[model samples]
Target: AAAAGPQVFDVGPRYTNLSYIGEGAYGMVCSAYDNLNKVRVAIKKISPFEHQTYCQRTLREIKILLRFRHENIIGINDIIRAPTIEQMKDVYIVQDLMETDLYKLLKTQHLSNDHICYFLYQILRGLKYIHSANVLHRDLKPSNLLLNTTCDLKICDFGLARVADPDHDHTGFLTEYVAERWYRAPEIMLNSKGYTKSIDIWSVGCILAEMLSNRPIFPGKHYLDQLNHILGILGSPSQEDLNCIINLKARNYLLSLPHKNKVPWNRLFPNADSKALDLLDKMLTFNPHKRIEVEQALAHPYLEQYYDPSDEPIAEAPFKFDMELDDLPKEKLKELIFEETARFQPG
Candidate 1:
């Protein structure tokens, strides 16, 4: 008998799936080897028919991923879809394959100080580019951060990200809620309007704490509990902090709580080094304005050795998308994405 060809499964002509990786709210992900590139890749199969809202989100994610060009940001290699509109049911987004995500990595192993600093440095580097383009990641949790065996980390998942309008007061434009409960910022919890890029920095702080403690810093059971958990550590916000909150009800609710002094850094992380604690304190500030910006956070003493000036460049192009898509009907949403995919040529 003649030798049999390599076993294959029908994914597409250009790629072959070796295993099912995982699935989430967006879609299913699989580990595949690209025939043309002759390299491993992760293919995310997103169904456009799931829901109108999901379809809209998927469109925004594709638009953002297509434009991003940063070492620490996940890059989209190719977008595969049906040849014709009638046959289009799912969109397969091909991206660099990684060994695992941070969530899984943290579960299996504890990170050293070196690992923490380097990982955080890369995140800041990526955010520098992202924020420079006036884009807010909005969601920055462990699972959304992809990692390789070599410790290279890339921020992924733009479904919740939004472009920050520099001139406009985006308070009402901003989403009422975003990010995971554990990583949610104080401003988001308080439903503050016109929140700024600092929201992401707050999340970075929570992640840093989790990396150090090997668990979520504010593992709140609910939004209210989450606030309580944050207060327990950071203490009640100062009167000045409350004044910054734009939501009157939220401000009043916070003021009604018993007054508490800010917790000392040494007590929160007894084992943490001075430099690490200092950076953490700056990032986890209750007031968004007081929270360290990406550039400032990157320049912190803890990350001094890892700081690279070249990492903070403005994006080659401004991040822009049709905000009108938020209300487009399902059919029109499909047509818009199809049109976008036709014009997209990945770099």
Candidate 2:
């Protein structure tokens, strides 16, 4: 007789009581208890059978998370799929469960400067690890950043992330609406085809600003309005600055807008200390090339007390993955996921 097909089951003995948490572009997420580890974990269920996009997104997220092992980066506890092909429906990704996300936490309470510094430090630390891996976290916002009552944070949600190409060419790869409007970088809003890791740094600045004010600094209703909001604060891009934009249409559109001088830094953050203002100024620069990198931002005087040489790690060899899954047929996609699950959870 042939080997028996793997036992078919739902959730099984490993996890229990899957309570729905929330849902997004990918699929629904729930909280569950790990019987073996005796811990609570968040399990994201993506039904690859539902659509090809979701399947590809699920695979991409898994591929990226498997390579991460940093304290500030979310850890994968397990990858669960059906034992047999005919029974396969949903792919479950188990990860650490947090009390809340930064979005909810910020709404309920205000953070002091000490709290701000600590939070920003952790964000940068996580970004440093991510960028060093040559990955761009295109979708970064408060809700995507999980937080515990103890102030520990882990960057989550890698569905929109992509491996940074060596040639810095993202023309066909990057989408215009990868990140939420509130935290999106100016280059992305301007439809710049080829951007860099600095796009994430701009988001960090926006998050930091929100932490200080308890409100989104540039809350635009739409793309055009987003540029208006940014220009209103940062002033019109200089002719030279406009010329640097890789997208011809975006550059011309910006040039056509009336000139506006930048709002004074002190006026914008009246209560912020000098060091805090200085860091914000560098982060929110109009030119991506001029924006601070993760290491430089970590060393700024605002983060001086929190800075530790041990926190920064040398860039590691990039993780390898099958990038062709986006175009794979349903059966091939299913096979790829099954192989990945087995690789991560060998018997």
Candidate 3:
């Protein structure tokens, strides 16, 4: 753990007590009380121009977080600005402060069926809006999920972020952290010819299984081992399944894989809800084509109790990143960001 004196935040005088909270996957965080809103808020810092890729990430994130409006999706309410456009280096985005994330919660507590059901509904509900936005939540592991003491779960990273969980020392976000393979879908794991948002569904399935089993369903030591663990449960796909498989070499590799039998969900999760397992079956399908979509998954009997067509909102205008931004120079990116901040925090 690293210790430092209180960090300063230029967030308007409307907030107070900028206590260093923890590190997030992307930057440092502080908890402050929003005097105006009369609630605690999390202020996080991320360099907008740390590099080209990060610049793109920063731009995409700010746009997405603002565009998405959902109860289950965390939203950024404000941003602190630099005095001049050229002077901008970092952004302090403010959102609701969360006690901990799903990963830490799963580690410390046992999740009952109701807990899983509610958490699952919120995830699917939030994801439905995200998918309708023409975006994909490529990363959806437990850590990427946020929770309140009341059992509320919000998907960040596509909320769109990787925020701070104040409970742990969060220094890891300063460095690059690869998405672990534990919740990866088969298409991504095996390097299939193409993949769709269904990959996200597969991730949800993995997460659901973890919630029920009280552990990661597939904790592969490494990449190859990851697929081995999955195949051990999913079994080798039939030749028909090979249709989505990669080239001849990739096809041969799968063909050569040791044939394994599909493990029945009941045997694996002896007491899990039958409907939940059934939904999981549709989610973990090998064919991205056959996997359940966010909307369909919500309609499943497992989530039937929480499903309401009127309650789930959709994004009418899909997210489309400005193609020209990729070519725009860094200083211009700063010019845009400086202007971006003013919208959230008026003078």
Clashes of each: 2, 0, 2
Using TM-score, give the best candidate's number: 1
Model 1 regions more than 4 Å off: 1-10, 166-178, 193-195, 320-322, 343-347
Q: Write the per-residue lDDT of candidate 2 for residues 103-222, one digit (tens) a residue.
A: 998898888889888889999999999988888887778888899869899999888787775355434213457468888778776755433688889889999888888888999998
Q: lDDT per model, in order?
A: 0.79, 0.78, 0.75
What would the per-residue lDDT of candidate 3 be over residues 232-292, giving only the tens digit for each residue? 9888887788876545655676788879999999999997999999998999888777889
Ordering by lDDT: 1, 2, 3
Where does candidate 3 stray beyond 4 Å? 1-7, 159-178, 192-195, 320-328
lDDT, candidate 1, 306-330, per-residue tens: 8877756668887664356667888
Q: Point out the worst 10-residue segment of candidate 3 by lDDT.
A: 165-174
Model 1 TM-score, all chains together: 0.91
In terms of lDDT, the best-performing candidate is 1
Between prediction 1 and prediction 2, which has the larger lDDT? Answer: 1
Candidate order, TM-score descending? 1, 2, 3
Each candidate structure's TM-score, on Cα atoms with residue i matched to residue i, is 0.91, 0.89, 0.88
